């Protein structure tokens, strides 16, 4: 047993090839509409794969009008997670992603102006596997 975990401090995100270092949360999932159909002779139901759909959520602290200016244009998100205790790093890129809604305005009381972005992505590429 050894400590080889990873921390969000190591996260590096290039929104369209630009380091959006101000994003303090990110998550992306690649789900499949697995059809499940029940066969006559088989007791247990059979699950059949289907087409995949990529969704991603990304929220941070506002520092400019980047996303509002970006609009619904297609773009790319490159995510790099690097182990610092030992060398090696994971690197992912969402092949073609679009926003589902512009967080046009958001603010409340004395709190910092947080920004939340949600969208979908067609596909992905796994550039490094650790």
Partner 1 sequence: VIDIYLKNEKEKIDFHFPVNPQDSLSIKKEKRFETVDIVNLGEFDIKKEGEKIREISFKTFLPNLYSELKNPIEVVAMLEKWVDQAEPLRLIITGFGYNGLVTISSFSNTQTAGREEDRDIEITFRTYRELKISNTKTDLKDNRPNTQTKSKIYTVKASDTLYKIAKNLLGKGSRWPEIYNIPENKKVIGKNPNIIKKGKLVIPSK
Extract the tokens encoding 106. Answer: 């958001």
Q: What is the gyration radius of the CA atoms in the chain, in angstroms?
A: 19
Buried/exposed 52-85: b ≥16 CB within 10 Å, e otherwise? eebebebebebeeeebeeeeeeebebbbbbbeee
Query: Does residue 90 interact with a second copy by CB under 8 A?
Result: yes
List the x/- string, 3-32, binding to a second copy by CB under 8 A: -xxxxxx-x---------x--xxxxxxxxx
Nearer to a second copy, 87 or 129 (CB): 129
Alpha-carbon distance values, 35 to 31, 38, 53 (Å)? 12, 10, 14
Query: Does residue 48 interact with partner 1 by CB under 8 A?
Result: yes
Query: Does residue 49 interact with partner 1 by CB under 8 A?
Result: yes
Backbone angles phi, psi at 48, to 5 degrees: -115, 135
Among 5, 41, 86, 87, binds partner 1 (CB under 8 A): 41
Among 1, 29, 33, 111, binds partner 1 (CB under 8 A): 33
From a second copy, partner 1, none, interface partner of 41 (C-beta below 5 to 8 A by class): partner 1
Which positions lie near partner 1, rule CB under 8 A? 32-33, 35, 37-42, 48-52
């Amino acid at each position: 047993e050894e400590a080889s975990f990873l921390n969000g401090s190591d996260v590096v995100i290039l929104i369209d090839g630009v380091e959006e270092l101000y994003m303090e949360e990110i998550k992306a999932d690649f789900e499949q509409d697995e059809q499940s159909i029940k066969l006559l002779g088989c007791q247990n139901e059979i699950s059949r794969v289907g087409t995949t759909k990529g969704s991603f959520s990304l929220n941070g602290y506002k520092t400019d009008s980047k996303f509002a200016k970006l609009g619904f244009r297609s773009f790319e998100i490159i995510y790099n997670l690097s182990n610092s205790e030992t060398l090696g790093y994971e690197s992912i890129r969402l092949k073609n992603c679009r926003l589902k809604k512009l967080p046009l305005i958001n603010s409340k009381a004395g709190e910092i102006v947080k920004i939340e972005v949600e969208g979908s992505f067609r596909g992905y590429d796994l550039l490094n596997e650790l």
